[PDB]
């Protein structure tokens, strides 16, 4: 629902590179595979952490009590 | 920029305005907008036997809206009806014309029960909700709809399939049981079912309202055909091989000394059961048994028994062809011989019988005040409506919730009509839609209805089926399919005479089996001289949209017939028309389809694409790719991967696997767990398995783009080393990483509801 | 091949409709029942060919024409719509005559003539 | 295969005109199905033997069939060479329509492409009529285990 | 609510009909590793491929591997999808083998394994059949009042 | 040969499906002599031996007139004349001939007279005539001359009767067999039915792998014995 | 490209003429047209549209006398019963000087054999020991209005043209 | 369609196969299986 | 014999005419055929 903190197969911390991954794609736009390498995700186990991450916390947070 | 590999963009154009739950949604929209009227008009008036002046008639009906209100009524939203265990329903406002005192009075907006409405249909509040109104009503916009919420539990009415109703089907075996069904069904004006059996080389006529079966020559003489040479010309023709087979049936008519229609009708007049009410003669009964008793969709209205005699003669020609060649039989499992009964058809069976039993139980209480004292004290007759209006509500709700189908008037006792919607995956909620039930699940055979047929190419999914006790008896519909809407046929009949058939009352019965005869829904109508010019001019009226689509015409040759079907419950499939060796959809149309204009159903109106029935695919020759178009082709596939349904599109590269493997995935994609919905944390369900960090597949499919699977996925991308390791992975066990599980690989979550009701008592 | 076989048989029925119409001339009281479509174009105002094409009786006379083409064929046009024609019922075996009924008091069954054959005209869809 | 496709097409043209002599147990249609099924069954043997004799040592499914682990030499052949005839109930694919098996083939066709002979391997990937013909024989054995 | 993690005995599956159970959980310094240091999350036996003939799982791994090295999701749609001969073009572009077989070291003994290991990302899905909801056992308990059997 | 082949041996099925009957010939080399004995066990209907079946209705005599040939009789070498066919018609008695009325016209023709409605029974006798059995055994549906794999000729009769086939000349009755175990019991006793149960199960299972020890079959033969 | 045009003309509607289809008598005998069943005693039933033609058949050729006179009260004439159902778009066409003339055929009768004398031998042989239902009850309760016979009417050949001329 | 005494004895849920030949037993468990090469074959 | 009479087309069942000459005559129609000498073929 939200980004994993670490890569599953290495334990490399990838949770701090989701907020910055979306900025490399939205502004100053890159082709999703040099935006990975610019964040420094060499190993393919670590690239698949945020490339195939579907972010469901943004949709779940639309349905709370307005509070 | 556009080429041969771009015609698959019609598949997002088809599914955009249609969807995948349209076979539930359109049927329920048809019921609450057309079929509610055709139930009220079938029994409009209430006749009080005591004082035959206090009548009561229903003018019209509408659900969910008062006529004086300019706005639709407020409904409790569908998620609140899940939580509070209510039934998501809408009030049925009838308005009524009745007599009170000494004058007649119209009363407006009588509520007779409440109708449990389907989600995402017209009367549902989710209809045209812009995904920010879904969030206010706590609803997932990726939910399919198409189901009912009855007592909190969400229930789906499955797609039933029956055998084709008003058509003829030829069976045979050794020991010579060549029987011919025709399950006649005009709605319940009559629901009847004739046979034709050969015993001892002698053709009979069994019917379940006859004491003992009638031979076949003295039942055509019961109709107008009595010349006894034309009986040898309606069932044999000039074929000398068939004249030997039928000649035994001729002399049996002389052996009973039956020679006129007067004497022929009097034979069957003394063979009937259920003589009840009129004490009419055996002539008046035998002429009634041909009227509306044997083949009930062919009601006769006058002296002319011609086309009904031609019906039974063309039944018994198919028997004699089956006696001569035993391979001229009909497949019971062929997909063209099926009809898919959808949810509007079932509820129109259900809501009618409760409105029968409403009006019966209202008539036997409208006289319990008339024949009692206070004669001068009149009563408004609208205070006992709510005495029985809680049987409309409670009988609709019970039959959907229990799934039981107890129709006293129609005489059907079906079980397993509904099911609880599956909330195991996102795929389970969409795989429980598009699912088809069958009639074979009471008696057992081997290798019959469980083998898939080649006639479900593109109509049914060729891998989504359970394994075990239901393999091939539960089945699933593909992506680009459509179920036909039943429409009127007497405009289509009157188009046939203009196009050049000449009527069955105009044609000689001698030369009837020399020309192709047209068959509007199995009933013989005329006889064309030039058939392929007639068929070509009927497609051309359909491709110009004069006559409707979902009206299929196909020219058989061994039967030498031209059939025209227009009834509902057939499965269509869109194809691209090709002409003179060239696909008609050019790259200018795909250029227009992409940039906003000229959607799907502009490809229908402009003559580019076409729905084909299963039967009309006989009269065709279909290319798969544009490089394969030879000049004798007549259609082209829009996209070949729609041979698989919604669930079997999750498989990556299915054409490289073995075929039993792609079937096990369909059962196991529904069992895998991941994300369900966007209100999955706002819902309180019985058992809800979720995944903490679900990932979308690295290798995906067009078919899971379309069904929005990669926004609620169920699984994670594992790094997989295909190797043999530790000896703990021998026969399907798999070796797992500890540090992956510690970081959240494969980590799930279970949720379970527990309801107590603090009931108050009578004490 | 089958559309070519129905083409030549229509070409065979076009000489066969021309003989049986010219031979039938001025043989008195000898008819031919022949089938028109149920709805006709209007004649107080001329419905144009594509308008009668879409939606698919008391009349005066000279409402049409049976045109003989130079090649081998025939085509009825009525008003301005153009139809096609063929001897298309069957080679009839049952023998046919025409009887006039009289209503109430001059009650008579006048035997007019005998049917030669039956030709059909369809709109050229 | 093209030799087998040419021999099977020089055998149906001797059948559309009635010319084929029969074995003493069959008629002319059934003796076609033995000459045309027994000739497609020998090109799984020809092309299969070219496969298995060509895969090198330290091929993985060749070891797992020399062992007697999971694997046959037919399973390896179908993944590499021709998958072959999809036999349904002993016969070929039945005519699921009026006078052909599938609308993508011409009416009255007894060609091996049309009656069930899949030619693509599982590595090659099955063609859309090859996919359905293999899927029918799959369920026919998937309900023969229940 | 209940949180639960993979135990010995939960069912995982790929999307190719190969159901499987968890047989052992291994400490991650015992798993094999490549030159970059990647260890598998799942190890799958080579004996589930030849009898079952799932060659489309052998193409899901390369298309999965070449796509994640390229940064693009690939397609494995029926009668089409991405092609093996240019998924193997992306895969040599980096410096991986074309066939998806890597030279893994052994985590237990440190040495090179004597075979190249077919290695990359497969999409696994976890099924609802979990061994916590299936392990049960009875010594003595309630009896049916008619038959007085368990 | 399936598991319903086992399931029809396991219970004493009186009527089994496909009850083929082997037969060993004394002429294993002459192909024509194989065709002689094949026609002697095969039943021959009247349709395959006649030209036509007609009836003539002269002024007081009405008769079914059947013409047969002899060019069929020498091709399929039956020992059948025109006289015992007329015997075999009267032998049938499923059609109520009052058999003293049959006449025989010279060398090619048999006139079945009839005299007392007269037309109803003569119509029913018109179609019930050309399918009666004139030569052969009635329960034998068909027979196939089969070449054994050494070249010998042992025909596969496919009917019910074994006493009739084993007594037919040319067929040696010591070495002919039957699938039907209850029908072997009626002619050959119980001990040749025990020895035939264990041989039809050592042959049904052995066509499917299933290398059961034979002593598990011999005990199954003896419970049924 | 045409050659000639035939003036397709129409007639009026004040006639309500019918057409007959004898289901038993063939059209041809020796490639010539067969001869018409000559003399008739026709009758009609309005509101039920039944045609009954009484064609007398010849004696002394193939007609027995003891059979007809003993139990069928000595009949020598055959009644042909048919129903006139309407069929639109039907037009008779006589052609005078290369001009056809459409006349609207109102109903078509499918004339089949009928046996009145079995109904006579039904009632008179039981008295010794002694929706569409309405459409037959209206039929048998109505007197069949007899029509005199007229053959060779040439006045209709001019009656169309005098109302074509406008 | 009530059960009589014969209906309590018939079927594979009745007495003769369902209470006398087959019956739920005590001191038993049922669990998913899983491999282990390290423990002996017995 | 499957031969139908003229004028009503029913089946000409033959009969023993008054214990004399065989004649084929229709029932419910006084047609007859006295001195036939007729036959049929059926291969
Ligand atoms: Zn992590
Ligand atoms: Zn990593
Ligand atoms: Zn007669």
C19 by Cβ neighbours in 10 Å (0-12 / 13-18 / 19+) ranks as: exposed
Contact G9 C63 (CB under 8 A): yes
As a whole number of angstroms, the distance between CA F77 and CA F84 comes to 16
Residues sharing a CB contact under 8 Å with residue E109, sequence separation 6 or more, in sequence order? none
Query: Computed from CA positions of residues C13, C15, C18, C22, in that sequence, does the dihedral angle turn out positive or negative?
Result: negative
Which residues in chain A (4-43) have CB-CB distances under 8 A to chain E?
Answer: 8-10, 31-36, 42-43
Yes or no: say if B22 and B484 are a contact pair by the CB < 8 Å rule.
no
The shortest C-alpha distance from F219 to chain I (Å) reads 57
Interval between CA E82 and ligand 2 midpoint (Å): 25
- Return the half-sphere exposure (C-beta side, CA atoms, 13 A cut-off) of residue B207: 25
Considering only CA atoms, which of I34, F222, C104, B753 is closest in space to residue G145? C104
- Quick one: tokens of B219? 């039942």
The shortest C-alpha distance from D12 to chain E (Å) reads 30
Residues sharing a CB contact under 8 Å with residue C57, sequence separation 6 or more, in sequence order? C40, G13, G104
Interval between CA E38 and ligand 3 midpoint (Å): 100
Asked if C95 is an interface residue toward chain B (Cβ–Cβ < 8 A), one would say: no
F74 by Cβ neighbours in 10 Å (0-12 / 13-18 / 19+) ranks as: exposed
- Quick one: tokens of A66? 């307005």
Give the nearest partner residue to A54 out of B694, B698, B740, using CB atoms: B694
Query: Computed from CA positions of residues B518, B520, B521, B522, in that sequence, does the dihedral angle turn out positive or negative?
Result: negative
Yes or no: say if E41 and B719 are a contact pair by the CB < 8 Å rule.
yes
Which residue in this structure is represented by tokens 């010591």? F174
- Quick one: tokens of F125? 């006798």
Query: DSSP 3-state assignment of G113?
Result: strand
Yes or no: say if B552 and B565 are a contact pair by the CB < 8 Å rule.
yes
As a whole number of angstroms, the distance between CA E46 and CA E38 comes to 20
Closest B-chain CA to G113: B227
As a whole number of angstroms, the distance between CA B534 and CA B514 comes to 16
Residues sharing a CB contact under 8 Å with residue E137, sequence separation 6 or more, in sequence order? H28, H29, H30, H31
DSSP state of F209: B
Yes or no: say if B145 and B118 are a contact pair by the CB < 8 Å rule.
yes
Measured between beta carbons, the chain H residues lying within 8 angstroms of E136 are 29-31
Give CA separation, B655 vs B9, B33, B64, C52, in Å.
21, 44, 49, 52
Residue ranges with strand state E in B17-74: 45-46, 56-63
Contact H35 E131 (CB under 8 A): no
What b-and-e string marks burial along C57-76, b requiring 16 or more CB atoms within 10 Å of the CB? eeeebebbbbbbeeeebbbb
Yes or no: say if B9 and B705 are a contact pair by the CB < 8 Å rule.
no
Yes or no: say if C52 and C41 are a contact pair by the CB < 8 Å rule.
yes
What is the separation, in whole angstroms, between the first and last Cα of chain A? 22
As a whole number of angstroms, the distance between CA B354 and CA B391 comes to 8
Which residue in this structure is represented by tokens 């050494």? F150
As a whole number of angstroms, the distance between CA F168 and CA F155 comes to 13
Residues sharing a CB contact under 8 Å with residue D63, sequence separation 6 or more, in sequence order? D69
Residue ranges with strand state E in B410-560: 412-414, 418-420, 435-437, 475-476, 482-483, 517-520, 523-524, 552-555
Query: DSSP 3-state assignment of C92?
Result: coil
The shortest C-alpha distance from D21 to chain E (Å) reads 41
The shortest C-alpha distance from E119 to chain D (Å) reads 15
Considering only CA atoms, which of F90, F116, F113, F118 is closest in space to residue F103? F113
User: How many distinct helices (H) and strands (E) make up chain A?
Assistant: 4, 0
DSSP state of B31: I
The shortest C-alpha distance from B439 to chain C (Å) reads 41
Yes or no: say if C101 and C116 are a contact pair by the CB < 8 Å rule.
no
Asked if I11 is an interface residue toward chain B (Cβ–Cβ < 8 A), one would say: yes
Which residues in chain B (408-437) have CB-CB distances under 8 A to chain E?
Answer: 424
Residues sharing a CB contact under 8 Å with residue B380, sequence separation 6 or more, in sequence order? B98, B100
Percent helix, strand, coil in chain C, to 5, is 20, 30, 45
As a whole number of angstroms, the distance between CA E71 and CA E69 comes to 6
* Residue H30: other Cβ atoms inside 10 A: 9
* Residue I8 labeled ligand binder: yes
Yes or no: say if F21 and F173 are a contact pair by the CB < 8 Å rule.
no
What DSSP line would sit under B50-65, residue for residue? SSTT--EEEEEEEES-
Query: Computed from CA positions of residues D106, D110, D111, D117, in that sequence, does the dihedral angle turn out positive or negative?
Result: positive
Query: Computed from CA positions of residues B714, B717, B718, B721, in that sequence, does the dihedral angle turn out positive or negative?
Result: positive
Residues sharing a CB contact under 8 Å with residue B539, sequence separation 6 or more, in sequence order? B553
Which residues in chain G (43-72) have CB-CB distances under 8 A to chain C?
Answer: 44, 51
Considering only CA atoms, which of B400, B406, B434, B436 is closest in space to residue B419? B400
Residues sharing a CB contact under 8 Å with residue B524, sequence separation 6 or more, in sequence order? B307, B310, B311, B314, B504, B517, B518
Contact B730 H37 (CB under 8 A): yes
Interval between CA B720 and ligand 1 midpoint (Å): 17
Give CA separation, C89 vs B211, B225, B306, B511, B709, in Å.
42, 21, 18, 10, 59
As a whole number of angstroms, the distance between CA A38 and CA A21 comes to 9
Give the nearest partner residue to B660 out of D106, D128, D142, using CB atoms: D142
Yes or no: say if B506 and G108 are a contact pair by the CB < 8 Å rule.
yes
Phi and psi at residue G124, to the nearest 5°: -80, 5
Q: Is B339 left (phi over 0), alpha (psi -120 to 50) or beta?
A: beta
How does strand G9-10 pair with strand G99-104?
Answer: parallel
As a whole number of angstroms, the distance between CA B184 and CA B332 comes to 17
Contact G95 C66 (CB under 8 A): no
Resolution in A: 3.2
Considering only CA atoms, which of B421, B443, B365, B527 is closest in space to residue B145? B421
As a whole number of angstroms, the distance between CA F7 and CA B564 comes to 49
Considering only CA atoms, which of F22, F21, F75 is closest in space to residue F48? F75
Q: Which helix (H) or strand (E) holds B611?
A: strand B609-611
Interval between CA E58 and ligand 1 midpoint (Å): 27
Phi and psi at residue I8, to the nearest 5°: -140, -10
Interval between CA D6 and ligand 3 midpoint (Å): 64
G3 by Cβ neighbours in 10 Å (0-12 / 13-18 / 19+) ranks as: exposed
Angle separating helix axes C2-22 and B531-543, nearest 10 degrees: 110
Over H3-41, what HEC string results? CCCHHHHCCCCCCHHHHHCCCCCCCEEECCCCCCCCCCC
Phi and psi at residue B495, to the nearest 5°: -75, -25
Yes or no: say if B666 and B63 are a contact pair by the CB < 8 Å rule.
no
**Domains, in order of start, for chain A:** 1-67 (1.10.10.60)
How does strand F44-45 pair with strand F133-135?
Answer: antiparallel
Query: DSSP 3-state assignment of F113?
Result: strand
* Residue I5 labeled ligand binder: yes
As a whole number of angstroms, the distance between CA C32 and CA G105 comes to 11
Residue ranges with strand state E in chain F: 21-22, 24-25, 44-45, 50-57, 62-68, 102-105, 109-114, 133-135, 143-144, 156-157, 171-172
Closest C-chain CA to B632: C1
As a whole number of angstroms, the distance between CA H24 and CA H6 comes to 22
Give CA separation, G15 vs C109, G12, G159, in Å.
12, 8, 10
Considering only CA atoms, which of B92, B143, B89, B77 is closest in space to residue B118? B89
Interval between CA E109 and ligand 2 midpoint (Å): 22
Which residue in this structure is represented by tokens 């994670």? B716
Contact G112 B226 (CB under 8 A): yes
Closest B-chain CA to H32: B733
The shortest C-alpha distance from G122 to chain C (Å) reads 31
Closest F-chain CA to I19: F60
* Residue I29 labeled ligand binder: yes
Give CA separation, B354 vs B347, B400, B471, B548, D16, in Å.
10, 13, 36, 34, 61
Contact A59 B678 (CB under 8 A): yes
* Residue F193: other Cβ atoms inside 10 A: 20
Considering only CA atoms, which of F121, I42, F47, F65 is closest in space to residue B241? I42
Yes or no: say if G13 and G105 are a contact pair by the CB < 8 Å rule.
no
* Residue F168: other Cβ atoms inside 10 A: 18
Yes or no: say if I24 and I36 are a contact pair by the CB < 8 Å rule.
yes
Contact B729 H35 (CB under 8 A): yes
- Quick one: tokens of F109? 């023709």
- Return the half-sphere exposure (C-beta side, CA atoms, 13 A cut-off) of residue F205: 16
* Residue A5 labeled ligand binder: no
Yes or no: say if I11 and B238 are a contact pair by the CB < 8 Å rule.
no
Yes or no: say if B472 and B452 are a contact pair by the CB < 8 Å rule.
yes
Query: DSSP 3-state assignment of A62?
Result: coil
As a whole number of angstroms, the distance between CA I31 and CA G63 comes to 5
Q: Which helix (H) or strand (E) holds C55?
A: helix C49-55
Which residue in this structure is represented by tokens 């491999």? H35
Q: What's the Rg (C-alpha) of chain D?
A: 17
As a whole number of angstroms, the distance between CA B68 and CA B742 comes to 64
Residues closing a segment before a gap in chain A (C–N exceeding 2.5 Å): none
As a whole number of angstroms, the distance between CA D83 and CA D48 comes to 9
What b-and-e string marks burial along F86-105, b requiring 16 or more CB atoms within 10 Å of the CB? bebbeebeeeebeeeebeee
What DSSP line would sit under B541-580, residue for residue? HHHTTSS-SS-EEEE-SSS-EEEEE--S--EE-EEEEEET
Yes or no: say if D47 and D82 are a contact pair by the CB < 8 Å rule.
yes
Chains B–C, number of C-beta pairs less than 8 Å apart: 63
Contact I27 B260 (CB under 8 A): no
Q: Which helix (H) or strand (E) holds G52?
A: strand G50-56
Over D69-118, what HEC string results? CCCCHHHHHHHHCCCEECCECCECCCCCCCCCCCCCCCCCCCCHHHHCEE
Query: Computed from CA positions of residues B535, B538, B543, B547, in that sequence, does the dihedral angle turn out positive or negative?
Result: negative
As a whole number of angstroms, the distance between CA G65 and CA F79 comes to 56
Q: What's the Rg (C-alpha) of chain C?
A: 17
């Amino acid at each position: 629902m939200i980004v994993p903190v670490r890569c599953f197969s290495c334990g490399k911390v990838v949770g701090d590179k989701w907020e910055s991954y979306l900025n490399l794609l939205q502004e100053d736009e890159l082709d999703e595979g040099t935006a990975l390498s610019r964040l420094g995700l060499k190993r393919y186990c670590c690239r698949r952490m945020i490339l195939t991450h579907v972010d469901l916390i943004e949709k779940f947070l639309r349905y709370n009590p307005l509070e | 920029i556009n080429t041969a590999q771009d015609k698959w963009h019609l598949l997002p154009a088809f599914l955009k305005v249609k969807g995948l739950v349209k076979q539930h949604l359109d049927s329920f929209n048809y019921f609450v907008d057309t079929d509610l009227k055709k139930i009220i008009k079938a029994n409009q008036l209430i006749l009080s036997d005591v004082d035959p002046e206090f009548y009561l008639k229903y003018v019209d009906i509408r659900v969910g809206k008062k006529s004086s209100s300019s706005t639709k009524d407020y409904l409790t939203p569908p998620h609140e009806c899940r939580l509070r265990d209510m039934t998501y329903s809408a009030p049925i406002y009838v308005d009524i014309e009745y007599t009170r005192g000494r004058n007649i009075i119209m009363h407006k907006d009588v509520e007779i029960g409440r109708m449990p409405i389907m989600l995402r249909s017209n009367k549902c509040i989710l209809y045209d909700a812009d995904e920010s109104k879904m969030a206010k009503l706590n609803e997932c916009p990726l939910d399919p709809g198409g189901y009912f919420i009855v007592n909190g539990t969400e229930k789906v009415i499955l797609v039933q399939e029956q055998l084709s109703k008003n058509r003829i089907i030829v069976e045979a075996d050794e020991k010579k049981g060549i029987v011919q069904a025709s399950v006649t069904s005009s709605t319940h004006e009559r629901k009847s079912k004739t046979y034709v059996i050969t015993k001892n080389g002698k053709i009979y006529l069994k019917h379940n309202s006859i004491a003992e079966e009638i031979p076949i020559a003295i039942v055509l003489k019961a109709c107008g055909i009595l010349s006894d040479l034309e009986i040898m010309q309606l069932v044999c023709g000039n074929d000398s091989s068939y004249q030997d087979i039928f000649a035994v049936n001729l002399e049996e008519s002389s052996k009973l000394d039956i020679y006129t229609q007067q004497q022929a009708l009097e034979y069957i007049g003394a063979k009937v059961k259920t003589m009840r009410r009129q004490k009419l003669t055996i002539l008046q009964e035998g002429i009634e048994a041909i009227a509306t008793t044997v083949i009930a969709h062919l009601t006769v209205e006058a002296l002319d028994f011609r086309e009904k005699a031609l019906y039974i003669a063309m039944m018994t020609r198919r028997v004699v062809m089956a006696m001569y060649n035993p391979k001229m039989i009909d497949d019971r499992d062929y997909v063209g011989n099926k009809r898919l009964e959808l949810a509007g058809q079932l509820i129109s069976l259900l809501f009618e019988d409760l409105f029968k039993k409403f009006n019966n139980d209202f008539k036997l209480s409208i006289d319990k005040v008339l024949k009692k004292p206070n004669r001068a004290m009149e009563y408004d007759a609208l205070l006992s409506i709510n005495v029985h209006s809680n049987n409309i509500t409670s009988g609709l709700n019970r039959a959907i919730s229990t799934g039981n189908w107890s129709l006293k008037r129609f005489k059907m006792e079906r079980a397993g009509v509904t099911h609880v919607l599956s909330r195991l995956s996102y795929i389970s909620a969409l795989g429980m839609m598009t699912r088809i039930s069958s009639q074979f699940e009471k008696s057992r055979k081997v290798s019959g209805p469980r083998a898939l047929q080649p006639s479900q190419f593109g109509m049914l999914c060729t891998a989504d089926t359970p394994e075990g006790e239901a393999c091939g008896l539960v089945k699933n519909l593909a992506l680009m399919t459509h179920i036909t809407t039943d429409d009127e046929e007497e405009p289509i009949k009157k188009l046939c005479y203009v196009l050049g058939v000449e009527d069955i009352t105009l044609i000689d019965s001698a030369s009837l089996h020399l020309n192709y005869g047209v068959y509007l829904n199995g009933t013989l109508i005329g006889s064309i001289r030039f058939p392929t010019k007639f068929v070509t001019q009927f497609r051309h009226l359909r491709r110009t949209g004069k006559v409707s689509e979902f009206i299929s015409i196909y020219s058989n040759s061994h039967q030498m017939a031209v059939h025209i079907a227009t009834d509902g419950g057939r499965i269509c499939r869109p194809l691209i028309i090709v002409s003179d060796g060239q696909s008609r959809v050019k790259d200018i149309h795909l250029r227009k389809l992409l940039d906003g204009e000229l959607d799907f159903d502009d490809f229908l109106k402009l003559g580019l694409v076409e729905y084909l029935d299963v039967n009309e695919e006989n009269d065709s020759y279909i290319a798969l790719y544009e490089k394969d178009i030879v000049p004798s082709m007549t259609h082209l596939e829009i996209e070949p991967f729609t041979i698989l349904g919604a669930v079997a599109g999750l498989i990556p590269y299915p054409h490289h696997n073995q075929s039993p493997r792609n079937t096990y995935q369909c059962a196991m994609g529904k069992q895998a767990i991941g994300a369900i919905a966007y209100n999955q944390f706002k819902r309180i369900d019985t058992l809800l398995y979720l995944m903490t960090y679900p990932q979308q597949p690295m290798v995906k499919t067009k078919t899971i783009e379309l069904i929005d699977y990669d926004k609620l996925p169920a699984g994670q991308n594992a790094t997989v080393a295909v190797m043999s390791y530790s000896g703990y992975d021998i026969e399907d066990a798999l070796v797992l990483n500890k540090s992956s599980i510690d970081r959240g690989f494969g980590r799930c979550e279970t949720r379970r509801k527990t309801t107590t009701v603090l009931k108050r008592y009578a004490n | 091949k089958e559309a070519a076989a129905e083409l030549e048989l229509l070409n065979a029925d076009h000489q066969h409709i021309l003989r049986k119409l010219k031979k039938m001339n001025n043989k008195p009281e000898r008819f031919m029942v022949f089938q028109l479509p149920t709805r006709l174009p209007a004649f107080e105002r001329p419905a144009v060919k594509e308008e009668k094409e879409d939606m698919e009786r008391e009349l005066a006379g000279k409402v049409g024409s049976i045109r003989v083409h130079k090649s081998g064929k025939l085509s009825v046009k009525i008003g301005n719509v153009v139809m096609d024609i063929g001897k298309g019922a069957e080679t009839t075996f049952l023998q046919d005559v025409i009887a006039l009924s009289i209503a109430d008091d001059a009650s008579s069954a006048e035997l007019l003539g005998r049917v030669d054959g039956k030709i059909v005209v369809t709109p050229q869809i | 295969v093209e030799i087998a496709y040419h021999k099977c097409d020089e055998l149906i043209t001797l059948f559309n005109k009635g010319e084929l002599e029969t074995q003493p147990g069959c008629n002319e249609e059934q003796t076609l199905e033995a000459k045309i099924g027994g000739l497609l069954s020998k090109v799984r043997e020809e092309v299969g033997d070219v496969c298995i004799n060509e895969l090198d040592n330290w091929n993985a499914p060749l070891i797992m069939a020399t062992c007697g682990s999971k694997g046959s030499t037919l399973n390896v052949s179908q993944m590499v060479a021709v998958v072959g005839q999809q036999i349904i109930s002993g016969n070929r694919v039945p005519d699921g329509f009026q006078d052909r098996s599938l609308p993508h083939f011409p009416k009255n066709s007894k060609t091996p492409q049309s009656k069930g002979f899949v030619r693509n391997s599982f590595f090659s990937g099955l063609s859309p009529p090859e996919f359905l013909f293999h899927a029918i024989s799959g369920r026919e054995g998937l309900v023969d285990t229940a | 609510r209940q949180n639960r993690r993979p135990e010995l005995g939960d069912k995982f599956s790929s999307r190719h009909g190969q159901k499987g159970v968890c047989g052992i959980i291994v400490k991650q310094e015992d798993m094999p590793f490549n030159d970059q240091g990647i260890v598998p999350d799942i190890i799958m036996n080579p004996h589930g491929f030849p009898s079952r003939m799932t060659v489309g799982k052998m193409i899901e791994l390369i298309s999965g591997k070449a796509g994640v090295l390229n940064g693009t999701l690939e397609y494995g749609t029926c009668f089409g999808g991405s092609k093996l001969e240019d998924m193997s073009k992306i895969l040599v572009d980096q410096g991986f083998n074309y066939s998806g077989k890597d030279m893994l070291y052994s985590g237990i003994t440190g040495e090179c394994l004597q075979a190249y290991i077919f290695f990359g990302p497969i999409y696994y899905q976890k099924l609802k059949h979990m061994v916590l909801d299936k392990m049960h056992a009875r010594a003595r308990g309630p009896r049916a009042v008619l038959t007085r059997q368990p | 040969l399936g598991v319903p082949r086992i399931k029809e041996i396991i219970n004493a099925s009186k009527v089994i499906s496909t009850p083929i009957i082997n037969a060993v010939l004394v002429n294993d080399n002459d192909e024509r002599a194989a065709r002689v004995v094949k026609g002697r066990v095969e039943k021959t209907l009247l349709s395959d031996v006649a030209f036509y079946v007609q009836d003539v209705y002269k002024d007081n005599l009405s008769f079914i007139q059947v013409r047969i040939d002899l060019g069929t009789i020498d091709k399929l070498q039956l020992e059948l004349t025109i006289e015992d066919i007329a015997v075999a018609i009267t032998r049938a008695s499923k059609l109520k001939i009052q058999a003293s009325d049959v006449n025989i016209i010279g060398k090619d023709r048999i006139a079945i007279n009839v005299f007392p409605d007269v037309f109803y029974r003569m119509q029913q006798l018109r179609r019930a005539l050309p399918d009666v059995v004139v030569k052969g055994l009635p329960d034998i549906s068909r027979a196939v001359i089969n070449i054994r794999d050494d070249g010998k000729r042992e025909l596969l009769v496919e009917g019910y009767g074994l006493r009739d086939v084993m007594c037919t000349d040319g067929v040696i009755g010591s070495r002919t067999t039957t699938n039907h175990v209850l029908e072997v019991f009626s002619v050959l006793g119980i001990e040749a039915a025990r020895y035939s149960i264990i041989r039809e199960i050592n042959y049904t299972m052995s066509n499917h792998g299933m290398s059961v020890d034979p002593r598990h079959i011999q005990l199954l033969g003896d419970v049924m014995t | 490209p045409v050659i000639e045009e035939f003036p397709l003309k129409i007639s009026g509607e004040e006639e309500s003429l019918h057409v007959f289809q004898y289901a038993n008598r063939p059209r041809l005998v020796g490639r010539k047209p067969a001869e018409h069943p000559f003399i008739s005693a026709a009758r009609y039933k309005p509101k039920s549209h039944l045609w009954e033609i009484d064609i007398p058949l010849d004696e002394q050729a193939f007609y027995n006398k003891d059979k007809a006179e003993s139990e069928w009260n000595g009949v020598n004439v055959q009644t042909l019963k048919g129903v006139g159902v309407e069929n639109n778009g039907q037009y008779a066409a006589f052609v005078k000087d290369m001009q056809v003339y459409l006349v609207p055929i109102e109903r078509v009768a499918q004339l089949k054999p009928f046996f009145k004398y079995i109904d006579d031998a039904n009632v008179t042989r039981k008295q010794e020991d002694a929706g569409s239902l309405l459409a037959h009850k209206v039929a048998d309760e109505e007197a069949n209005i007899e029509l005199t016979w007229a053959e060779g009417t040439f006045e209709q050949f001019k009656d169309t043209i005098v109302k074509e001329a406008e | 369609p009530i059960r009589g005494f014969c209906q309590r004895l018939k079927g594979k849920q009745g007495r003769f196969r369902g209470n006398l030949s087959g019956k739920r037993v005590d001191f038993s468990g049922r669990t998913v299986i899983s491999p282990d090469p390290n423990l002996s074959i017995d | 014999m499957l031969s139908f009479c003229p004028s009503c087309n029913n089946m000409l069942l033959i009969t023993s005419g008054d214990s004399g000459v065989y004649t084929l005559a229709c029932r419910s129609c006084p047609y007859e055929f006295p001195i036939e000498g007729i036959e049929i073929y059926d291969r």
